[PDB]
Symmetry: D2
Subunit: 115 residues, 4 copies
């Protein structure tokens, strides 16, 4: 239900080996960690979470972009890239978090398949 696609805007390839964590907002305004992962070479993570693990609610996906640029040899601006959103996965609703990275800029977009 939750997929990601991270692209490197400098190299024109997906951003591989990007560490991420998915958190779910709790009733008291806190966060609970529901999964972690690292993108494969296609800048994707497969079987990140399952349907039952992704009920309606506010989610935060944190991407370790600083480590990504460091490893690539660039010094980046952001300490992390955070994507915080409301998810309504009722039906067939699948979410793709598209992330476009440059050392001093990123774009976070979502593609939400209907039901």
């Amino acid at each position: 239900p939750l997929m990601v696609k991270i692209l490197d805007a400098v190299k024109g390839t997906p951003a591989g080996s990007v560490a991420l964590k998915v958190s779910q907002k709790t009733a008291d305004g806190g966060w609970t960690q529901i999964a972690t992962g690292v993108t494969d070479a296609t800048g994707e993570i497969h079987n990140l979470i399952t349907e039952q693990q992704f009920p309606a609610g506010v989610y935060r996906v944190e991407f370790d972009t600083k480590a990504y640029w460091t490893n690539q040899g660039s010094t980046p601006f952001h300490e992390v890239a955070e994507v915080v959103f409301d998810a309504h996965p009722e039906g067939h609703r699948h979410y793709t978090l598209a992330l476009l990275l440059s050392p001093f800029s990123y774009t976070t977009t979502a593609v939400v398949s209907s039901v």
Copy 2:
């Protein structure tokens, strides 16, 4: 396919369906020759746009009718058209995906030239 597209609608949060596009190749005299046209499907893609044989190295211009897209959406767009012009280097089984993120008053054109990082 050596040339793929992926168009996203940044307003609706879905791929941009029914976007008309055309692919032209720069000729020796500096003019443009149209080699393919098409319209994106519901996934914001166009399958079998051109073949490897139709894609020798050279300068290509892919023009997207984003103005009609927004107009059909009931929106007011800025750009007359979205243009992506690039020198293609297909040697070594390099394929291109032209990613395009659309908003009425903004678009982002990115290119992916491998399916994997390195």
Copy 3:
């Protein structure tokens, strides 16, 4: 004004007016302490957000209430908020401009470090 913002609305093609934001500084224990808040004017900027005195070297978080902005505009947006987290090195009159481009289902955060 070591810390400036410039927010644009990619749907309307104008700056994003009345966008609420808050600036937090990371503390020794890893937590966040809020040092300023503001709301963008019609040019999508906030003047005199913080002073050089308030902006020492360290890690900062600028959080923009984009959800409220889109809700007010009449759209249902994706993001609950827009978060910009960065290590600042303002020592030496280093200015930071956080440029933010907004659409209901996408935003771009860029930095111009002068």
Copy 4:
């Protein structure tokens, strides 16, 4: 000035200086006539690019030499050029700012229209 530009370099986190550009106006026959050329300064802008008298309503094309910008940076660019094509409606003292966000394999073209 009815037509401004603001070019940023997303790799360095600075405006993009010394970017060459050309402004053309579409003619009645579908062709193009050049009305201005310029090069951005260190703030990624070009001052006094054209006058209001030179900017009537119509379709304009602004071509940015981003390929040379990246080549000079020692990088490898994707795009052969960056072109921004739009129907301009300056009536009622509307000015345009073409914002351009550059990375080697990606750029964002946005427009800001203000009543100034």
